[PDB]
Design a protein around this nucleic acid. Structure first.
Ligand SMILES: [Mg+2]
Ligand SMILES: [Mg+2]
Ligand SMILES: [Mg+2]
Ligand SMILES: [Mg+2]
Ligand SMILES: [Mg+2]
Ligand SMILES: [Mg+2]
Ligand SMILES: [Zn+2]
Ligand SMILES: [Zn+2]
Lengths: 132, 343, 218, 103
RNA sequence: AUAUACCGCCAUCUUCAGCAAACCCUGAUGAAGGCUACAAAGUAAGCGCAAGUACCCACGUAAAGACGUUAGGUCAAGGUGUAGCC
């Protein structure tokens, strides 16, 4: 019996999202990679740095946007540029949303010395793929 | 480290230890259970040690049509806010941890005299607000299986009634207590027995029967007599709408058989109109308060029978030694006539 | 309230839809309804309907037959005039084709195939939240192939649905509301019953139509 | 209020309604059959004990011969016999006081 | 210190095919059961098997392999409840 990035089946009252509903052997079969970079490919390097900065910024923005997110992040690094993509809920105010967006953008830029942009999609309530 | 840190839901899972060995086999725990807590809702995103005033999230952005800027919360204001947060958490925890007062029914830690509220609404839409529920018993039946071993499944027996002569009992089995309760309540509201009553509060005449080695004797009584009966009988009579009776049970004491036999008797009872239509004579009731006066209750809807019933002396009648004892008065028992509680 | 008056008017009148003209004991004896299984196939609750026995065979009381048949036809016609939905059952494969065809011709519905468990009680869950169960059931063959009482009579008595079944010497008329003694197995009797019900329900429908037309006129 | 106007007041109705007063009271006691002799008193040395009877806990009430629609609470309207203290749920002191008051 | 508090990760029967919320019915309304197709009370959400995808195919190999049994292994990957040195 293997338990890896999968949810235990309940009576059927458990809203679950696509990525955590599907198993870790459906990554390329029925899913996509959350992060997109070339450090994993052959010939390049700095993969450890890519991964550590990925996890860092993921946890950072998760903790600076508490209770608002409804999924994991999606990172898109095209050359030097960095693009964050998130899905959040329309709970707090657009004032707070924009202020936190600018703050996080500035911090990421001054920290990683990288040009960064962020995009977020609003949802009334987090989508559900199944009821497990 | 900061990287070593991780989300809180897994921390709470690992701290609670809801499943893995403590739960299975039913060994459980010696009455210690950690309650989950949500700090995310507690404090808004503004609170920090250094109390910088944020016009974007912490303070309104505009005041008097004037833009704001970053400012400092001094030490006095910081400690004031800290005391406010402390007291607020204190009242939150207080309101969280409090007493639970479910109406004591037959006894503490017993599910006898509790009502679950009216039945649940139907799909087509049928509000049963007039119906009231009561739970006769609760027992945890077990069946064994190869892989699970002892498997606990709770069975429940419930009764429901209007208070207008209509009622019904049912049973519900499931692994969850609330689910079994709901099943049984729905089953009862679907399966209803109606029973007549003489003067809206009594049976028509004394009844005595047996059901699956459970002997019962229910005796009619006049107004203001009270309900000196088994607690289950009292609950079901409260549901029916009758407020006075006597009842005794001997042999076996099994709640489901008791209920079934009682409902069977109250359904097979005889009404005075039916009895008149059958016999072909006029009924006459006589009281002890009222003198020698014939009180007509009901008459045959059909033609009256001309000749009366022939008076039969020394009739073939089966009666009870307990009845003879109570009539002779020679019987003695300290446990019979007591100053019991209200009804 | 005049609608309720119209709905109630046929009640006070007996044989108001002219059901007595349909059947005659001559036709019954011609269709061989008086037949019954052997005395070994006899049933206690069916006894009183048996006029007698001959050559280890049972004979039905045709007076009681006609009485119960008149009552049943009048009830069915009243329900049809009331728009109450009626459902036929006959598990016998020998007549399912004919029964479905006459049901189509009438406009009323039937079920000749295998009866499924919990079809009526759990019918809401089966079909949908709100479904109009038929206000009347009838039985052209009360018993199933195993020769035990069909589940439909019990389910209908449960959900308070009236039933009109033709009962053979082996059947149990206790649960039936309007049981009509007869010969379940004979094709002549089957066709006779089918034609009688056709005439009855069609008369009821056309009478309702002309009555509502007269009221629209008035 | 020493008069009986507390009963006609609205707080009494909303607190009880059309039901009797003793109807809601419930006794804490040993298992099964309760004791046949109620508590001696609900108040002592200007101090009240836990689970007191209703007429003692509601100090606004006054046991008086004049409050007829109150004193008829316990004696059945269909049976002139007064109910006993284990039935009404009250203590012996106020029970006896009520008995002589109704007499 | 406690794997006999746990999460996280897995061995295991598995070289299995069963597990089942929500309803109905039977047994006198009991623990429980619900199988007959020329058909008699079962209907079934969902999971898994399966199918399909990966490799060279449609086969094969991998992968997957639920509910649960072994208080199975792991506080020494990491974190953490409790008890302790502080
Ligand atoms: Mg493996
Ligand atoms: Mg207790
Ligand atoms: Mg272990
Ligand atoms: Mg493998
Ligand atoms: Mg597979
Ligand atoms: Mg072990
Ligand atoms: Zn036959
Ligand atoms: Zn007192």
């Amino acid at each position: 019996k293997n338990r890896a990035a999968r949810v235990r089946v309940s009576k059927g009252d458990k809203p679950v999202t696509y990525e955590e509903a599907h198993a870790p052997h459906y990554i390329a079969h029925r899913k996509g990679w959350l992060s997109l970079h070339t450090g994993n490919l052959d010939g390049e390097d700095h993969a450890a740095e890519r991964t550590v900065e990925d996890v860092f910024l993921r946890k950072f923005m998760w903790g600076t946007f508490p209770g608002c997110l409804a999924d994991q992040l999606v990172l898109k690094r095209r050359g030097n540029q960095l693009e964050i993509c998130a899905v959040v809920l329309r709970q707090l105010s657009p004032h707070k949303y924009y202020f936190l967006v600018g703050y996080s953008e500035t911090l990421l830029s001054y920290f990683y010395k990288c040009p960064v942009r962020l995009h977020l999609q609003t949802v009334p309530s987090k989508v559900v793929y199944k009821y497990l | 480290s900061f990287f070593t840190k991780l989300t809180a839901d897994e921390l709470w899972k690992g701290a609670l230890a809801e499943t893995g060995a403590g739960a299975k086999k039913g060994r459980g725990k010696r009455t210690k259970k950690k309650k989950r807590k949500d700090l995310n809702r507690g404090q808004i995103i503004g609170e920090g040690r250094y109390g910088f005033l944020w016009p974007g999230l912490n303070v309104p952005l505009m005041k008097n049509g004037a833009v704001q800027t970053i400012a400092q919360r001094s030490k006095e204001e910081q400690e004031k806010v800290e005391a406010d947060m402390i007291q607020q958490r204190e009242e939150w925890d207080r309101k969280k941890k409090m007493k639970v007062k479910r109406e004591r029914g037959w006894s503490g830690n017993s599910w006898g005299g509790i009502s679950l509220g009216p039945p649940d609404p139907g799909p087509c839409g049928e509000t049963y607000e007039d119906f009231d529920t009561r739970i006769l018993e609760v027992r945890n039946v077990f069946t064994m299986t190869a892989k699970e071993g002892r498997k606990k499944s709770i069975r429940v027996l419930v009764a429901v009634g209007n208070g207008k002569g209509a009622a019904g009992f049912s049973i519900g089995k499931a692994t969850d207590r609330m689910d079994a309760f709901r099943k049984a309540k729905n089953r009862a509201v679907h399966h209803l027995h109606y029973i007549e009553r003489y003067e809206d509060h009594t049976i028509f005449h004394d009844i005595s029967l047996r059901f699956k080695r459970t002997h019962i004797k229910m005796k009619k009584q006049p107004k203001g007599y009270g309900l000196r009966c088994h607690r289950a009988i009292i609950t079901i009579c409260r549901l029916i709408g009758i407020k006075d009776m006597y009842a005794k049970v001997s042999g076996s004491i099994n709640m489901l058989s008791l209920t079934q036999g009682l409902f069977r008797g109250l359904s097979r009872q005889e009404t005075h109109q039916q009895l008149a239509d059958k016999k072909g004579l006029h009924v006459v009731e006589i009281r002890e308060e009222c003198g020698p006066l014939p009180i007509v209750v009901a008459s045959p809807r059909g033609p009256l029978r001309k000749d009366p019933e022939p008076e039969d002396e020394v009739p073939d009648v089966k009666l009870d030694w307990e009845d003879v004892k109570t009539a002779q008065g020679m019987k003695r028992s300290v446990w019979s006539n007591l100053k019991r509680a209200a009804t | 309230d005049f609608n309720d008056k119209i709905l109630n008017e046929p009640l006070k009148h007996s044989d108001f839809f002219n059901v007595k003209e349909l059947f005659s004991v001559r036709s019954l004896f011609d269709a061989r309804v008086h037949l019954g299984h052997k005395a070994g196939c006899r049933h206690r609750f069916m006894e009183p309907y048996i006029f007698g026995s001959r050559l280890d065979h049972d004979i039905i009381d045709l007076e009681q037959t006609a009485t119960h048949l008149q009552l049943a036809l009048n009830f069915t016609a009243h329900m049809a005039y009331r728009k109450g939905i009626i459902l036929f059952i006959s598990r016998n494969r020998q007549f399912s084709y004919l029964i479905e065809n006459m049901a189509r011709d009438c406009g009323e519905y039937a079920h000749t195939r295998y009866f499924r468990g919990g079809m009526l009680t759990n019918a809401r869950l089966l079909f949908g939240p709100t479904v109009r169960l038929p206000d009347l059931i009838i039985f052209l063959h009360t018993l199933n192939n195993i020769f035990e009482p069909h589940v439909a009579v019990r389910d209908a008595a449960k959900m308070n649905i009236p039933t009109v079944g033709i009962v053979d010497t082996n059947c149990n008329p206790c649960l039936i509301t309007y049981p009509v003694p007869g010969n379940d197995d004979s094709p002549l009797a089957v066709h006779l019953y089918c034609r009688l019900f056709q005439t009855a329900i069609t008369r009821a429908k056309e009478k309702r139509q002309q009555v509502e037309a007269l009221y629209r006129l008035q | 209020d020493e008069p009986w106007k507390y009963l006609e007041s609205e707080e009494y109705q909303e607190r009880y309604g059309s039901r009797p007063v003793w109807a809601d009271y419930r006794r804490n006691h040993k298992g099964g059959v309760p004791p046949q002799r109620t508590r001696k008193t609900c108040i002592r040395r200007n101090k009240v004990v836990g689970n007191p009877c209703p007429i003692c806990r509601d100090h606004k009430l006054h046991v008086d011969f004049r409050n007829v629609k109150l004193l008829e609470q316990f004696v059945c309207a269909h049976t002139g016999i007064i109910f006993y203290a284990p039935y009404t749920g009250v203590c012996v002191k106020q029970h006896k006081r009520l008995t002589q008051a109704i007499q």
